[PDB]
Design a protein around this ligand. Structure first.
Ligand SMILES: Cc1cccc(Nc2cc(Cl)nc(SCC(=O)O)n2)c1C
Ligand SMILES: Cc1cccc(Nc2cc(Cl)nc(SCC(=O)O)n2)c1C
Length: 277
């Protein structure tokens, strides 16, 4: 029963606002990532980390632009990589917080509700957007300057061997839906504005902003994806798949925390993981 009415013109306005915010908040878009991954970019090729030699040439070659002290550099490779991944996760939180602030209504929520949403949301968003940086062979790192191979990550000693494999498995299947940035901007807004995160004070306001975002998503997918009538339903099942991947990630992080008692976990990520339980 799709129609051009004042309601649909607004859902199109909401969609455009989210996209523009998204472009402002995330320097590496899916559009840019795909261009690099396929070679079609006019940018210089990323440096490829496929083994321990290229890892060390790459750590010399790639502009990571956040000093590792002479304490972490002393660390073995698997922990060095994990700590890099940790630093990038914290950045992604920063980027995602900025984006969620652009979501109409978000800032007018109670500041503690704004904090809860992000704390239980960010990791679902990180795995969503991580898929944009992944193909079957590997993942773009350091903002598209680098490419680390799936098999090189699998070669790391236990339990560092497994931490990315599930996100690759989620990505290959998510990426087959062929979402673009304009789709992802609404999909991400929907996730962040989840009413059923524990310890929110004001639930109905968040649900009201969401059901709106969801209508905008459904209209967007119908306009943007004539090839599927199933795509909205499939994306709702992805939202459920993502909570599981986050559950299984925490399991892994405990096995790390309680057998690698040496190594540092970023206190902000410790803050987030506290109550995923
Ligand atoms: C702070 C710093 C500087 C230079 C190299 C590294 N180690 C690495 C190595 C690799 Cl292959 N990947 C990373 S983080 C990857 C990412 O940016 O997603 N970090 C680190 C942890
Ligand atoms: C965008 C990007 C690229 C490469 C790595 C990461 N961070 C990840 C990805 C995965 Cl599969 N696992 C981790 S372990 C660190 C953590 O979130 O505790 N951190 C991120 C967020």
């Amino acid at each position: 029963s799709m129609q051009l009415n004042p309601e649909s013109a607004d859902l199109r306005a909401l969609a455009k606002h989210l996209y523009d915010s998204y472009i402002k908040s995330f320097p590496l878009t899916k559009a840019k990532a795909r261009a690099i991954l396929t070679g079609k970019t006019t940018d210089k090729s990323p440096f490829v980390i496929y083994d321990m030699n290229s890892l060390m040439m790459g750590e010399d070659k790639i502009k990571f632009k956040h000093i590792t002290p002479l304490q972490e550099q002393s660390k073995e490779v698997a922990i060095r990589i994990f700590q890099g991944c940790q630093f990038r996760s914290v950045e992604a939180v920063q980027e995602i917080t900025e984006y969620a602030k652009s979501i109409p209504g978000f800032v007018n929520l109670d500041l503690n509700d704004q904090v809860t949403l992000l704390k239980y949301g960010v990791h679902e968003i990180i795995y969503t957007m991580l898929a944009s940086l992944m193909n079957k062979d590997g993942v773009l790192i350091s903002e598209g300057q680098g490419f680390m191979t799936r098999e090189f990550l699998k070669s790391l000693r236990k339990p560092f061997g497994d931490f990315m494999e599930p996100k690759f498995e989620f990505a290959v299947k998510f990426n087959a839906l062929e979402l673009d940035d304009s789709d992802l901007a609404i999909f991400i807004a929907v996730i962040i504005l989840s009413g059923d995160r524990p310890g929110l004070l004001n639930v109905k306001p968040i649900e009201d902003i969401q059901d709106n975002l969801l209508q905008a998503l459904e209209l967007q997918l119908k306009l943007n994806h004539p090839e599927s009538s199933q795509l909205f339903a499939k994306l709702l099942q992805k939202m459920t798949d993502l909570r599981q991947i986050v559950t299984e990630h925490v399991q892994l992080l405990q096995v790390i925390k309680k057998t690698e008692t040496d190594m540092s976990l970023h206190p902000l990520l410790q803050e987030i993981y506290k109550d995923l339980y």
